[PDB]
Amino acid sequence: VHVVSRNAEGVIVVDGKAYPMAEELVATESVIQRSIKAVAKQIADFYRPLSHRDTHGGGGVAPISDENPLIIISVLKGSYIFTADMVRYLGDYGLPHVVDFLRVASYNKMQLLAETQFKALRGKHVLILEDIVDSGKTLRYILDKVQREHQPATLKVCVLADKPGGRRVTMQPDFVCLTVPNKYVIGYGFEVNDRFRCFRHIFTLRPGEARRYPAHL
Amino acid sequence: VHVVSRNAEGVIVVDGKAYPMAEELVATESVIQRSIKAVAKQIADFYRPLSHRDTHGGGGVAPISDENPLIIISVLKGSYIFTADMVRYLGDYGLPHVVDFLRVASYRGTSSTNKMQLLAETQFKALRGKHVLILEDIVDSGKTLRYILDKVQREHQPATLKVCVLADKPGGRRVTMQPDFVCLTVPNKYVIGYGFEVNDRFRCFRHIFTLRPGEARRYPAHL
Numbered sequence: 001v002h003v004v005s006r007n008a009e010g011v012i013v014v015d016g017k018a019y020p021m022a023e024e025l026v027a028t029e030s031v032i033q034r035s036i037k038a039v040a041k042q043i044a045d046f047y048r049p050l051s052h053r054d055t056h057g058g059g060g061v062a063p064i065s066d067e068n069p070l071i072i073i074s075v076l077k078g079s080y081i082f083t084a085d086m087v088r089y090l091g092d093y094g095l096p097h098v099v100d101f102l103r104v105a106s107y108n109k110m111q112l113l114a115e116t117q118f119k120a121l122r123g124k125h126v127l128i129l130e131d132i133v134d135s136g137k138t139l140r141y142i143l144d145k146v147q148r149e150h151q152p153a154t155l156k157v158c159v160l161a162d163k164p165g166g167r168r169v170t171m172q173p174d175f176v177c178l179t180v181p182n183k184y185v186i187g188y189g190f191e192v193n194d195r196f197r198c199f200r201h202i203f204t205l206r207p208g209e210a211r212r213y214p215a216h217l
Numbered sequence: 218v219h220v221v222s223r224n225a226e227g228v229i230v231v232d233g234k235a236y237p238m239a240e241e242l243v244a245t246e247s248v249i250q251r252s253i254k255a256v257a258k259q260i261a262d263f264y265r266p267l268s269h270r271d272t273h274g275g276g277g278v279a280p281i282s283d284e285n286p287l288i289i290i291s292v293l294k295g296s297y298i299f300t301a302d303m304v305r306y307l308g309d310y311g312l313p314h315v316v317d318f319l320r321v322a323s324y325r326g327t328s329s330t331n332k333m334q335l336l337a338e339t340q341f342k343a344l345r346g347k348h349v350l351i352l353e354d355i356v357d358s359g360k361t362l363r364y365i366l367d368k369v370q371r372e373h374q375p376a377t378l379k380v381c382v383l384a385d386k387p388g389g390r391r392v393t394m395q396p397d398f399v400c401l402t403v404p405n406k407y408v409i410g411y412g413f414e415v416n417d418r419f420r421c422f423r424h425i426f427t428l429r430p431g432e433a434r435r436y437p438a439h440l
């Protein structure tokens with residue numbers, strides 16, 4: 001169980017630990033984990049009965065199985081902790097799956113930083129695991145690229161977080177674990193220059209803290 | 218308390234779930250997590266007293282801090298689950314750290330041994346004079362880690378370079394390689410579960426098992 005309060009300095013404390021960079025708590029670890037496990041059950045219920053291209057028996061179509069698993073593409077770096085937890089819940093619900101990774105970045109225009117290494121996704125069910133949908137530009141770019149380069153049977157998106165008010169392009173993920181306020185979030189994979197990703201809870205960031213670490217790593 | 222049993226087919230069952238690909242149980246989730254958390258305390262206790270190059274203020278040397286954190290390089294794809302768990306324990310013990318990834322792959326070839334390639338480079342570019350810790354899944358022959366250490370040292374010139382492995386298979390060594398931190402020791406068998414794979418299968422298991430002999434060729438098709 002968690003205790004969420006503010007100390008005498010007005011700083012958020014969760015389970016005895018102070019978070020002076022946080023404006024508000026969004027979700028505790030318990031709430032996050034319950035939300036991910038609930039979505040894992042939805043993903044397993046949706047994909048378990050489906051069939052797709054048989055690459056194990058070089059055959060036609062066959063059920064999702066350890067021979068022909070659901071293909072999961074995890075988006076680095078923000079989704080790796082979420083992915084590690086989600087795959088264990090998907091295993092709990094008995095969904096056969098395998099995970100590869102891609103990474104994208106913006107210069108705002110989008111560019112691939114790291115490509116997936118899976119090469120046989122034609123006619124396969126593919127699920128993207130991503131940390132958050134905000135404007136929707138990052139996921140529109142990933143979906144268009146995976147669709148044209150891999151030609152999957154179906155392509156869906158599961159996000160840990162949906163920031164509804166940030167949308168600038170049409171993008172509604174098929175699966176959403178949590179809804180967050182229209183603010184910059186940190187914790188549980190969410191970072192400020194790679195800091196704060198290890199927090200077990202999600203918080204909104206005090207606006208003055210966003211440029212605290214300007215030096216490139 | 219986990220319930221470990223065998224069904225009428227002789228298959229290992231842990232908490233009601235059957236593992237027909239497994240020969241024996243090595244470690245339950247409870248044992249694995251306790252072992253990782255213990256090593257996280259050792260890592261935090263070792264690094265929090267240290268200092269390294271100040272890139273935040275452009276001074277000389279400064280203590281490990283959120284301004285100048287420990288640099289962790291995680292080896293993809295094998296270490297991502299271990300890394301996700303370890304970083305949360307390191308945060309519990311108050312160790313300032315950041316994580317970047319290197320991706321290495323092994324391919325079946327025409328030569329005597331499977332061949333290694335670097336698929337993804339680190340994105341971090343200011344590791345000179347920094348304390349760097351590598352997080353890796355297992356040390357068996359030691360060849361993979363010797364390759365990674367040499368590369369990281371030559372390209373980044375770190376102040377110090379150490380290795381933490383989830384698993385040590387001591388009886389598989391072919392080259393000198395002793396990790397600085399070891400969470401658990403595994404039998405001289407092919408292990409699966411908790412990140413350990415057969416062609417990307419079995420990584421999601423909460424427990425570590427030994428693989429039934431010959432089952433490493435169960436999924437021959439390239440993904």
Ligand SMILES: Nc1nc2c([C@@H]3N[C@H](COP(=O)(O)O)[C@@H](O)[C@H]3O)c[nH]c2c(=O)[nH]1
Nearest residue numbers: 078133134135136137138183184185190191
């Ligand atoms: N830490 C933190 N990252 C993001 C992002 C990052 N930008 C991308 C998503 O943005 P978008 O949908 O606008 O294209 C992702 O790479 C995500 O990691 C959006 N919003 C936040 C937020 O509130 N907090």
Ligand SMILES: Nc1nc2c([C@@H]3N[C@H](COP(=O)(O)O)[C@@H](O)[C@H]3O)c[nH]c2c(=O)[nH]1
Nearest residue numbers: 295356357358359360361406407408413414
């Ligand atoms: N699933 C599973 N992988 C490996 C490996 C693989 N080879 C790498 C390390 O090998 P080595 O030390 O022999 O160079 C590991 O990162 C992993 O990919 C060795 N032993 C095992 C094992 O018992 N089980």
